[PDB]
Amino acid sequence: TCPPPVSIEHADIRVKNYSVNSRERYVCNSGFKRKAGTSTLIECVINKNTNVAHWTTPSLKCIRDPSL
Amino acid sequence: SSGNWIDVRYDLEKIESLIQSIHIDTTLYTDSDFHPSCKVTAMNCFLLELQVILHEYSNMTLNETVRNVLYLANSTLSSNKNVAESGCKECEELEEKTFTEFLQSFIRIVQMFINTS
């Protein structure tokens, strides 16, 4: 299983599944928006070589909602 | 320029076919109400959002194809470049749509570019 995910600034995440192949998504906090080009996704992938799983590195960037 | 936009649209059409056999749970900023006034701004938002697909999926052909779209689209916007636009919305204030709807609008704006190329 994957360890807890890293924290992203101005975002939260509630992981439903920590098992390998699981796909979870961060959610930018109210007042903030996922920057275009960045992803809210992280997937739990296994290192077959060592049997240790880890979350893929997120590219997410939460910026101030331009409409506010 | 229209020749370049033709290749771009053919790639987008290919992606439509490709994702018929790929689970896609990505939602992206989609500007279906794009206008000539802010056409370059809108195109750049479509192009920028593609990088999201590249980050979320490892499917080889899909990756090569979306990357192929970026290379050509950026090259064209770079080569045959024009004015600078104003009074245009930021990408983050567009509504998010399923990848399928994002692609359909992407194909429509590229068609606009072809028609006025």
Curated annotation (Swiss-Prot), chain A:
Tissue specificity statement from the Swiss-Prot or TrEMBL entry: Widely expressed.
Residues bearing carbohydrate: N17
Disulfide bonds: C2-C44, C28-C62
Residue intervals of the Sushi domain: 1-64
Post-translation changes: N-glycosylated and O-glycosylated. A soluble form (sIL-15RA) arises from proteolytic shedding of the membrane-anchored receptor. It also binds IL15 and thus interferes with IL15 binding to the membrane receptor.
Subcellular location: Membrane; Nucleus membrane; Cell surface
Purpose of the protein: High-affinity receptor for interleukin-15. Can signal both in cis and trans where IL15R from one subset of cells presents IL15 to neighboring IL2RG-expressing cells. In neutrophils, binds and activates kinase SYK in response to IL15 stimulation. In neutrophils, required for IL15-induced phagocytosis in a SYK-dependent manner.
Quaternary structure note: The interleukin-15 receptor IL15R is a heterotrimer of IL15RA, IL2RB and IL2RG. IL15RA also self-associates. Interacts with SYK.
Name of this chain's protein: Interleukin-15 receptor subunit alpha
Species per Swiss-Prot/TrEMBL record: Mus musculus
Gene: Il15ra
Whole sequence portion shown: 35 to 102 of 263
Curated annotation (Swiss-Prot), chain B:
Record organism: Mus musculus
Domain of life: Eukaryota
Major localisation: secreted
Gene Ontology MF terms in the entry: cytokine activity; cytokine receptor binding
GO biological process terms on file: cell maturation; extrathymic T cell selection; immune response; interleukin-15-mediated signaling pathway; lymph node development; macrophage differentiation; natural killer cell differentiation; natural killer cell proliferation
GO cellular component, one term: cytoplasm
Glycosylation sites: N59, N63, N74
Induction of expression: By type I interferons, double-stranded RNA, or lipopolysaccharides.
Protein name per the record: Interleukin-15
